[PDB]
Structure 1
Amino acid sequence: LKKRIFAAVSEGCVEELVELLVELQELCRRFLMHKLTASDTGKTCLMKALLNINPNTKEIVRILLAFAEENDILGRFINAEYTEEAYEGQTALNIAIERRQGDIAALLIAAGADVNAHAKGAFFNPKYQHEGFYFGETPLALAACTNQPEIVQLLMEHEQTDITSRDSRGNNILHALVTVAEDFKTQNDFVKRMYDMILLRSGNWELETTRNNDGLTPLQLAAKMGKAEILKYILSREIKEKRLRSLSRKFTDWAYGPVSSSLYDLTNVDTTTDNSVLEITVYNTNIDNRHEMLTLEPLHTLLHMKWKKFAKHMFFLSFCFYFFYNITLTLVSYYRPRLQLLGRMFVLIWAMCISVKEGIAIFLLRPSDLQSILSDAWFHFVFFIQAVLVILSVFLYLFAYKEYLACLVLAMALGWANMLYYTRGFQSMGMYSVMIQKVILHDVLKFLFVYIVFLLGFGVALASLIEKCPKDNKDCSSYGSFSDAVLELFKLTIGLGDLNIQQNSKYPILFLFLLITYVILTFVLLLNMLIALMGETVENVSKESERIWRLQRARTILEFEKMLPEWLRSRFRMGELCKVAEDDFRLCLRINEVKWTEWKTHVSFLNEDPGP
């Protein structure tokens, strides 16, 4: 049948294939040859010969080119596609490049091929980064995603390459290289090298400024995908060669031995436009790589300068105003009778103010914030509950009810628990204040579940173990109910109570047995609390404490920018040069660094002599 072609091409028998290829042309006497196709997939002879790369395959492709040109079938032969799910548009060039074959790929390119074929398949478009292989839907980003630079060089030298072509997902070559840079331990660093090579050969500012279908750029895509290596390369990209210096971002202003001034270009990194690089790399809880990605110079020094410029004055003022509000709430109920009347409105209009600002920011956030453990979302819950309790208690006090010391007492009970949140301003106190939340959210509830189970099991046992008093003694056995037994057992746990043998029971020794084994089990359970502490802190010491705190501080600085108006945004960066490059350069930032190891002669500095 037609399977004789498929078996022949997979074994490399050139003589056996040419034995019948000379008579298949005369078999049909002349025309959409369905023999070299597939109703399920859509294969061709030339395309199939390239998947099973056998050591004698150049002659097969050569005789296939001769067969293609002699029967005038190259349009539907060298440029074909599949017609089933997950595969569309996989031409011959999309596999010859894939099999690390350069000579056959160059032969197909010399025949014309497709070059800009869009392999728009569902396997090529996986839902996540593990169920499929997304390379860029073109036989140019396929060679760039792989480690083949020679095929990229000969492809970009073609007159029909169209390097600025857009993938059907809206991506580009730089977007495709960004999406596949998983890490350095499992991928090395060739992705950055291919990014630099393709960017240099493009030689213009249209690949980096191309907007994705998600409204993103390769810089912003690398920021949102956690690609710290590519982000570090782009933000610190310096090109000393002429005609390509406009593509660089970091410009060395001057250098005098160890000290040198670098003028980073934060024209898209600073939070001056919607969805900047800093805003994306801070407001993205779906990536864990935010730990080391925020440490880059145009981000780290930007956050430091912002904190030392306006965030400090807006954090101290907020803390002191909240402290005054909390102490006013404290001495308005304890000193309240059962002029200093102004203290009853400072807690009322401020509760309304919190109800407004928090009440609108409580829900204007992505659900992924609640997916993590610490994303500044639980504190929104606590502040909203405190404000709601204050206003509800005030309204209860005014109109009808008398619960003004039931829901209000909790107002300072939770309000004075919110002063711990404002410790993020101190480095040391902020370091101490992070595992307070972490240990509760991870380890304490683990013991709480087992301790509640032990309390429930022993509570119903000891309550039923007593002799039910005939009401001769009113407060009989001190374990009359399940709640009383639970209270007594918890009191015994914290070492405050009584362990009297005579508890007015039918079996005193069994009650004693249960009490002793409860103490032993509680002691073991409490020991495992320190054990779980050992299991979690000692691996990521100095990395789960202050690194997340720095992320919280950066988020606080970014949040403080939103609570100021347009006229207050006059604290932008420096330069406004329009001198480093021909186009209107927007902003720049100066960073100094001293190094006593590298020794070189610098020739690519910007300003001839130093001086800030």
Structure 2
Amino acid sequence: KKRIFAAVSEGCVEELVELLVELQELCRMHKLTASDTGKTCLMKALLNINPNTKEIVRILLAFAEENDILGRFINAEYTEEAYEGQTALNIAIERRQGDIAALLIAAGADVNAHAKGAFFNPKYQHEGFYFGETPLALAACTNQPEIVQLLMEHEQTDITSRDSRGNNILHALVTVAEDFKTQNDFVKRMYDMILLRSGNWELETTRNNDGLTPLQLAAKMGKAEILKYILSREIKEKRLRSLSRKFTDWAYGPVSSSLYDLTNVDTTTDNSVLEITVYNTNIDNRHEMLTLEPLHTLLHMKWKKFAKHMFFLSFCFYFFYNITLTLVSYYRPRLQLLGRMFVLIWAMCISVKEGIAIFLLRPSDLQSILSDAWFHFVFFIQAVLVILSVFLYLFAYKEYLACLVLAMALGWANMLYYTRGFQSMGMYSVMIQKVILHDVLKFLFVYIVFLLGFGVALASLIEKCPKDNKDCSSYGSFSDAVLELFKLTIGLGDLNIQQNSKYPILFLFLLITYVILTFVLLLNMLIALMGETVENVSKESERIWRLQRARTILEFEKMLPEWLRSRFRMGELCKVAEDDFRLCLRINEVKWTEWKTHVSF
């Protein structure tokens, strides 16, 4: 049995032509496979394509058809817990061998063979290789145009077939793309070729097991170039005009009237492309993808028609609430009850509005606490502080003043969330939120370590005063020493000597060492860190501000009720000529630079 395996491993043709003369004489069912994993000698010959590969598989199939078994084990199953679904055709297509694949197809193989396996369905990208688990999608994934033409030009090729994940061919082509264009992308052109060669609309309407079309899948995974191609797919042929999303109504030199399609792009359906591409910041590629034309003009016109007067209305309401919260405490007795009840009503309203938001969010957006999740926490804390302070006010308690003071001190510092309206201040606010969590926190931790280490040393260096009045030592406890060290860290004073310390020279030496470590080292390298951070941030924070404004627009869109959502897009095309089910958008875009370059040559 192992002799045939050794023959096919290194392409020993003479060994196999001797074996096919010796074996069948003893034969006059044949377990030619490995009998433990299902690896038949066809695959074992085809993982390693030796120079003599044609004749060996030809005589092997001739021996198979001589025993009336060629139609039985040609679709051999690699039955192992990792693969569980391989066939000879799958390996033949993968190994860049088209002839052998053509011969196997002509001999008769399983054209639609699902290669369902754990290794073939990896949990992450680096765990394994995902290719759609079909020979057709494998041929399309590994840049094999001739083989995919041969596979598609066949009778029983189930093109509209979905694997265990439910992915179609186009889902598989989307999942094997790249976030950034490598300038030699073949997945986009193979998507184009497959779309035009077969399938009208049900091939792209098939949904993943997650419930996504290839358009939504390309938006969610992060494939910017595929999303750009699909959202701006123009076909000028009348036969394939229905497979288009952009139509040029008229072209006049540099100006153009593109009629973009918003069938699944506008956020009027469930899990729209705009909502998907605006709520998945964790892949970080959601501004070069958000800058595409059908999304950029959608967000801009959404911001013009609404979500801007409402943003200013929200800022005005919060400003009035904050100023009437301030004037209640400042003008408090050591007639105007309308303000004293407006604070309660608005605090309760914003408390429940932030409570439903704090309960409806996912743990994914809490990463790095940057994706519009910190401000919800601070707004909820301020709201709960106001109502709780009111509760202790009615109960004739004493701690209401502390909670209300913290409430209004937090409220005036929470107005920085409303500065997204302006671009210039939006850059400043996103820089605030970035550097406090990136550079300030590390410096604070290091300085706190250097504070409580020197704090207890100086506190333990000095004993109690001889008069026991706690005035001649100035460091009588750990908290006192911590405060007195921080005061000279700011640069206020109290660094003088002779503080009743038994070792004045050592106390002075420790004070000088702490001064060096804080003022010369930590306070200076903090300058170093942001100084290096901003040179990379000043061109990147524009993406974050634009994405934050887009998320604000989508949030305000979701806030509107059903009856007020009559601000939809342009009406029907009437150009489909089949029930006119399309809902498009009129766009008049100008490209002066592109026109100048095109007309120059």
Shorter-chain TM-score above 0.5: yes
Once the 2 structures are TM-superposed, how far is the Cα of residue 340 of structure 1 from its aligned partner? 1.8
Once the 2 structures are TM-superposed, how far is the Cα of residue 525 of structure 1 from its aligned partner? 3.3
In the aligned structure 2, how far is the partner of 1:241 from the partner of 1:372?
49
Once the 2 structures are TM-superposed, how far is the Cα of residue 339 of structure 1 from its aligned partner? 2.7
Residues 180 and 223 of structure 2 are in contact (CA less than 8 Å); yes or no, is this contact kept in structure 1? no
Once the 2 structures are TM-superposed, how far is the Cα of residue 564 of structure 1 from its aligned partner? 1.1
Q: CA 1:545 to 1:215, structure 2 compared with 1: closer, same or farther past 3 Å?
A: same
Residues 285 and 372 of structure 1 are in contact (CA less than 8 Å); yes or no, is this contact kept in structure 2? no
Residues 135 and 145 of structure 1 are in contact (CA less than 8 Å); yes or no, is this contact kept in structure 2? yes
Residues 119 and 137 of structure 1 are in contact (CA less than 8 Å); yes or no, is this contact kept in structure 2? yes
Aligned length: 600
Residues 6 and 12 of structure 2 are in contact (CA less than 8 Å); yes or no, is this contact kept in structure 1? no
Comparing 287-296 and 387-396, the one that deviates more: 287-296
Residues 174 and 195 of structure 1 are in contact (CA less than 8 Å); yes or no, is this contact kept in structure 2? yes
Q: CA 1:164 to 1:539, structure 2 compared with 1: closer, same or farther past 3 Å?
A: farther
1:22-41 residue CA offsets vs partner (Å, 9 max, x unmatched): 2212222xxxx554112321
In the aligned structure 1, how far is the partner of 2:136 from the partner of 2:471?
86
In the aligned structure 2, how far is the partner of 1:217 from the partner of 1:21?
51
Residues 447 and 522 of structure 2 are in contact (CA less than 8 Å); yes or no, is this contact kept in structure 1? no
2:353 aligned residue: 357
Once the 2 structures are TM-superposed, how far is the Cα of residue 527 of structure 1 from its aligned partner? 4.2
1:226-256 residue CA offsets vs partner (Å, 9 max, x unmatched): 0111100000100111210110111111101
Q: TM-score, normalised by structure 2?
A: 0.96
Residues 303 and 554 of structure 1 are in contact (CA less than 8 Å); yes or no, is this contact kept in structure 2? yes
**RMSD of aligned alpha carbons:** 2.3
Q: CA 1:272 to 1:342, structure 2 compared with 1: closer, same or farther past 3 Å?
A: same
SS at match of 2:242: helix
Q: CA 1:236 to 1:598, structure 2 compared with 1: closer, same or farther past 3 Å?
A: same
Once the 2 structures are TM-superposed, how far is the Cα of residue 592 of structure 1 from its aligned partner? 2.6
In the aligned structure 1, how far is the partner of 2:571 from the partner of 2:431?
42
1:224 aligned residue: 220
Residues 159 and 169 of structure 2 are in contact (CA less than 8 Å); yes or no, is this contact kept in structure 1? yes
Residues 576 and 582 of structure 2 are in contact (CA less than 8 Å); yes or no, is this contact kept in structure 1? no
Comparing 77-86 and 554-563, the one that deviates more: 77-86
Stretches of structure 1 that go unaligned for 5 or more consecutive residues are: 606-612
Residues 255 and 261 of structure 1 are in contact (CA less than 8 Å); yes or no, is this contact kept in structure 2? yes
SS at match of 1:253: strand
1:162-210 residue CA offsets vs partner (Å, 9 max, x unmatched): 1111112111000000011024566931000110011111141011111
SS at match of 1:262: strand
Residues 351 and 391 of structure 1 are in contact (CA less than 8 Å); yes or no, is this contact kept in structure 2? yes
Once the 2 structures are TM-superposed, how far is the Cα of residue 286 of structure 1 from its aligned partner? 3.3
Once the 2 structures are TM-superposed, how far is the Cα of residue 560 of structure 1 from its aligned partner? 0.2
1:493-540 residue CA offsets vs partner (Å, 9 max, x unmatched): 101122211211111111111111111110233344445435642552
Once the 2 structures are TM-superposed, how far is the Cα of residue 601 of structure 1 from its aligned partner? 15
Q: CA 1:292 to 1:596, structure 2 compared with 1: closer, same or farther past 3 Å?
A: closer
Stretches of structure 2 that go unaligned for 5 or more consecutive residues are: none
Residues 76 and 88 of structure 2 are in contact (CA less than 8 Å); yes or no, is this contact kept in structure 1? yes
Residues 447 and 525 of structure 1 are in contact (CA less than 8 Å); yes or no, is this contact kept in structure 2? no
1:204 aligned residue: 200
1:428-485 residue CA offsets vs partner (Å, 9 max, x unmatched): 1111110101001010011101111111011001011113213344323111111000
In the aligned structure 2, how far is the partner of 1:597 from the partner of 1:603?
10
Q: TM-score, normalised by structure 1?
A: 0.95
SS at match of 1:537: helix
Comparing 258-267 and 520-529, the one that deviates more: 520-529
In the aligned structure 1, how far is the partner of 2:222 from the partner of 2:199?
26
Once the 2 structures are TM-superposed, how far is the Cα of residue 358 of structure 1 from its aligned partner? 1.0
SS at match of 1:246: coil
Once the 2 structures are TM-superposed, how far is the Cα of residue 598 of structure 1 from its aligned partner? 5.7
Comparing 226-235 and 583-592, the one that deviates more: 583-592
SS at match of 2:72: coil
Comparing 184-193 and 354-363, the one that deviates more: 184-193
Once the 2 structures are TM-superposed, how far is the Cα of residue 282 of structure 1 from its aligned partner? 0.8
Q: CA 1:598 to 1:580, structure 2 compared with 1: closer, same or farther past 3 Å?
A: farther
In the aligned structure 2, how far is the partner of 1:254 from the partner of 1:158?
40
In the aligned structure 1, how far is the partner of 2:383 from the partner of 2:320?
15
In the aligned structure 1, how far is the partner of 2:222 from the partner of 2:185?
15
SS at match of 2:259: strand
Once the 2 structures are TM-superposed, how far is the Cα of residue 47 of structure 1 from its aligned partner? 2.7
Residues 113 and 134 of structure 2 are in contact (CA less than 8 Å); yes or no, is this contact kept in structure 1? yes
Residues 443 and 526 of structure 2 are in contact (CA less than 8 Å); yes or no, is this contact kept in structure 1? no
Q: CA 1:529 to 1:438, structure 2 compared with 1: closer, same or farther past 3 Å?
A: farther
Q: CA 1:38 to 1:400, structure 2 compared with 1: closer, same or farther past 3 Å?
A: farther
